[PDB]
Copies of this chain bind each other. A is one copy, B any other.
Amino acid sequence: ELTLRTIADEDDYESYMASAYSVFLRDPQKDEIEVNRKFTELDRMIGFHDGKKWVATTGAFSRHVVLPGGAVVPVAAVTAVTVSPTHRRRGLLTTMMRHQLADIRSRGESLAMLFASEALIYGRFGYGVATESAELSGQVRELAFRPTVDLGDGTLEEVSAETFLASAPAIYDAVIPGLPGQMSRTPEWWASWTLDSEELQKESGKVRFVLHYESDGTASGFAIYRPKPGWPNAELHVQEVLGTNPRSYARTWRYLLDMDLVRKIKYHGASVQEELRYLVANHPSLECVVSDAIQVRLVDIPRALAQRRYAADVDVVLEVTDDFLPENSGRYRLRGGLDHASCEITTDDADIALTVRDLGSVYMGGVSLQVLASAGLVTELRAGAVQRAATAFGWPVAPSAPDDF
């Protein structure tokens, strides 16, 4: 006998998290679970319980994500989606998805996002891969910059997490409106993102924080990294580098690249068009491995298309097919540009037909709509409409992965 319910208490939450970690073949990291509890809404963490333990889980964090154009809209941060192997292939995931996607529409969140882990799972529920990330690595001795890179007058300082947290949120909130895909970070989220977890210490070492100051003393850049000593070939596992100006960005990177005793650097979760890739004088010296990052499930399709902005003017009619939620299917007229966006049901002839997962794949501008059509996954009903739609759905800045959840 299985029961769908929410978390009743933190004792039930610690058992809720223990079962989820158990599905991932991991001992529950008590430090990570404790810090993430500070922003865990127990009414949003659902799952199945057989009266003796949890056998399935599915959660969602109330977060806010930057869209193309600078809008910060509410988004469901889907997390902790597990089914115990003794109850798999029985429909438990299908039920939780239907309950969560209805709950997401309740709270006004126009879409949902989550990290794929295995991408082929959520495509049936309407999720589409919309963001890719690149793992950048290589020898720091080969990563000299182009001779025209301006490092500026800035200064850098190894500092504690709190002086970091006293300036980094100001630096973060200033640059993310221009970085679609990034999510806002409350004080409770910065605590988890800067957490010195024991598990990451096993892989490299304790966390360290750098701040970049301009000549007048203003903080303008930060860095999160972990050193892995080795023999001399130590490794720098970079977690995040950001700057309010190109000089603070290049100065912070050149600081990490010039660190004595270091030979190899690693930056996982970076953008596929990270500024560092184009600063290096020799591109092949910085290996770039691209993979999935964020999947998108449009819950309010007309509001989602009207919440973002488009790189160029577009007037296209889309015949959307939501196989998972047939009430969302329809035919909308999208009238969008750099400064306007409207999406309403229309009875006019359709220009393009595609599923809701394909509409979500191209939503953040990370996947080309034209490529999906030439591949046979999207159908052009009127000539020329796909090419102009693929350009408008694009964006000069590629989407990037937010902090982990």
Q: Spell out A's residues near B (CB within 8 Å).
A: 22-27, 84-86, 88-89, 116-120, 123, 129, 134, 141, 146, 148-150, 155-158, 178, 205-206, 208, 210, 227-229, 232, 234, 245-247, 249-250, 255, 258-262, 272-273, 275, 278-279, 281-284, 287-292, 311-313, 338, 355, 361, 367-372, 374-377, 386-388, 390-391, 394, 396-398
Contact = CB atoms under 8 A, between A and B. Distances in A.
A119 B376 CA distance: 35
A211 B25 CA distance: 18
Given A123-B146, A312-B312, A368 B282 contact: no
B118 A273 contact: no
A394 B391 contact: yes
B25 A229 contact: yes
A27 B228 CA distance: 10
Given A284-B119, A284-B292, A375 B23 contact: no
B377 A261 contact: no
Given A85-B255, A275-B375, 4 more contacts: A25-B262, A284-B291, A284-B292, A338-B388
Contacts of A205: 25-27
22 contacts: A23-B260, A25-B205, A25-B229, A84-B158, A85-B255, A86-B155, A119-B281, A119-B282, A120-B282, A120-B283, A148-B355, A245-B376, A246-B376, A279-B375, A279-B377, A287-B291, A289-B290, A311-B394, A312-B312, A368-B397, A371-B397, A390-B396
A258 B292 contact: no
A23 B311 CA distance: 46
Query: Which 3 A-B pairs rank lowest in CB-CB distance, beginning with the nearest?
Result: A246-B376, A370-B396, A312-B312
Contacts of A386: 396
A117 B27 contact: no
Given A123-B146, A158-B84, A396-B369, A278 B391 contact: no
A129 B283 contact: yes
A129 B279 CA distance: 12
Contact of A281 (B22, B123, B338): B123
Given A290-B288, A391-B394, A118 B282 contact: yes
Contact of A118 (B232, B249, B396): B232
A275 B370 CA distance: 10
